[PDB]
Scaffold this active site. Structure first.
Site, PDB file in Angstrom:
ATOM      1  CG  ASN A  13      34.774  59.987  20.483  1.00 24.44           C
ATOM      2  OD1 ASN A  13      34.464  61.181  20.611  1.00 24.44           O
ATOM      3  ND2 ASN A  13      35.074  59.198  21.505  1.00 24.44           N
ATOM      4  CG  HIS A  30      32.520  60.082  15.369  1.00 30.84           C
ATOM      5  ND1 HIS A  30      31.534  59.490  14.610  1.00 30.84           N
ATOM      6  CD2 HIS A  30      32.562  59.384  16.519  1.00 30.84           C
ATOM      7  CE1 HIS A  30      31.012  58.470  15.279  1.00 30.84           C
ATOM      8  NE2 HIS A  30      31.623  58.389  16.444  1.00 30.84           N
ATOM      9  CB  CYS A  52      32.027  62.937   6.353  1.00 32.67           C
ATOM     10  SG  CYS A  52      33.320  62.338   5.222  1.00 32.67           S
TER      11      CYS A  52
END
Ligand SMILES: CC(=O)N1CCSc2ccccc2C1
Length: 263
Positions: free
Chosen positions: A185, A187, A222
Site C-alpha cells: 500500500n 506505507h 514515515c
C-alpha cells in the site's frame, strides 16, 4: 499453516532462510517481526479479512486497524535451517482496540523460544483520526477471538515509555525508506522502524549482546519522501531508550526500549 482445532488461533511454521539471519547465523529480529506479520496476515485471511484486516463495515466506513505498540521478547533466535512454529491469535480490549499475540516455539523441541504482543487501534484511513470501536464491528471480529483471557504476557509489555531528552547518547541520522521498505500500500513497513531504531545501537553492543526485548510505540507514519533521525541512550544486562523523529522539524514518529543480554 492453519487455524487450530477450535478456530480461535492460527499456527504456521517457517524455515529460516540464508538472507534472514544475522552475523551469528541466527534470525535477525527483523526476520522475526516479519514472521509475526506474515502469520498474522494468514490468520486474517483464513477467516475472510484483508494488511489492514478490514471487515465489510470497516471498508464501508474507510476504517483500518493500525499498530499502536509492538512488544517482543526472544529467549532464543532460531538458526538458518531451523523450523520455528508460531501461534497467533487476537483478543478485544473493549472499545480501545484489539491485541494480537504470538508464541514462538522450536518445531523440534516444542519449547517456547520467544513471544510477542501488540496493540491495534481503529482509525479513519483518510483522516488518520482514531475512533473507538462501534458495537457493530465489535460483533464482526469477536467470533474469531477467545472470550476467556489468553495472554502471551501475563509486566514489561505494558510499561510506559518516556521521551528521550537531548542530547542523545548515540544517533543515526538521515535514514530514508527505499521501495523495499514500503508495503503493498506504499506505507513504510512496521519492520523498517524496528530496523531504524537499532541503527543507533553501537555496533560494539550488537557484537557482545543478543537482543532480548523490544517495546515500540507507534505515533506517526514515515512517508516515502521523509527522512528519520534514530536516537539512542543507555538507561543502564543493557537497556536503551529510543526515539525516531523527522530529521527536520523533530516530529516524533516512534519511541521504544530495548534490553540486551551478554552471550
Ligand atoms: C488486530 C487483528 O489482527 N485483527 C483485528 C481484531 S480480530 C482478528 C481475529 C482473527 C484474525 C484477524 C483479526 C484482525
Amino acid at each position: 499453516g492453519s487455524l487450530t482445532e477450535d478456530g480461535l488461533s492460527y499456527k504456521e511454521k517457517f524455515v529460516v532462510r540464508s538472507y534472514e539471519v544475522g552475523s551469528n547465523k541466527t534470525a535477525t529480529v527483523e526476520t522475526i517481526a516479519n514472521l509475526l506479520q506474515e502469520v498474522g496476515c494468514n490468520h486474517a485471511q483464513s477467516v475472510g479479512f484483508s494488511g489492514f484486516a478490514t471487515t465489510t463495515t470497516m471498508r464501508k466506513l474507510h476504517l483500518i486497524w493500525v499498530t499502536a505498540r509492538m512488544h517482543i521478547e526472544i529467549y532464543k533466535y532460531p538458526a538458518w535451517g531451523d523450523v520455528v512454529e508460531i501461534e497467533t491469535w487476537c483478543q478485544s480490549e473493549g472499545r480501545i482496540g484489539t491485541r494480537r499475540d504470538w508464541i514462538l516455539k522450536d518445531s523440534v523441541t516444542g519449547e517456547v523460544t520467544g513471544r510477542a504482543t501488540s496493540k491495534w487501534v481503529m482509525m479513519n484511513q483518510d483522516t488518520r483520526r482514531l475512533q473507538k470501536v462501534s458495537d457493530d464491528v465489535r460483533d464482526e471480529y469477536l467470533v474469531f477471538c477467545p472470550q476467556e483471557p489468553r495472554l502471551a504476557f501475563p509486566n514489561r509489555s505494558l510499561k510506559k515509555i518516556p521521551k528521550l531528552e537531548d542530547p542523545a547518547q548515540y544517533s543515526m541520522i538521515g535514514l530514508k525508506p527505499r521501495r523495499a521498505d514500503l508495503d503493498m500500500n506504499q506505507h513504510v513497513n512496521n519492520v523498517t522502524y524496528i530496523g531504524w531504531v537499532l541503527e543507533s545501537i553501537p555496533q560494539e553492543i550488537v557484537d557482545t549482546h543478543e537482543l532480548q526485548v523490544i517495546t515500540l510505540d507507534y505515533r506517526r507514519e514515515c512517508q516515502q519522501d521523509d527522512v528519520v533521525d534514530s536516537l539512542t541512550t543507555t538507561t543502564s544486562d543493557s537497556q536503551f531508550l529510543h526515539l525516531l523523529r523527522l530529521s527536520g522539524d523533530g516530529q516524533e514518529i516512534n519511541r521504544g526500549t530495548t534490553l540486551w543480554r551478554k552471550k
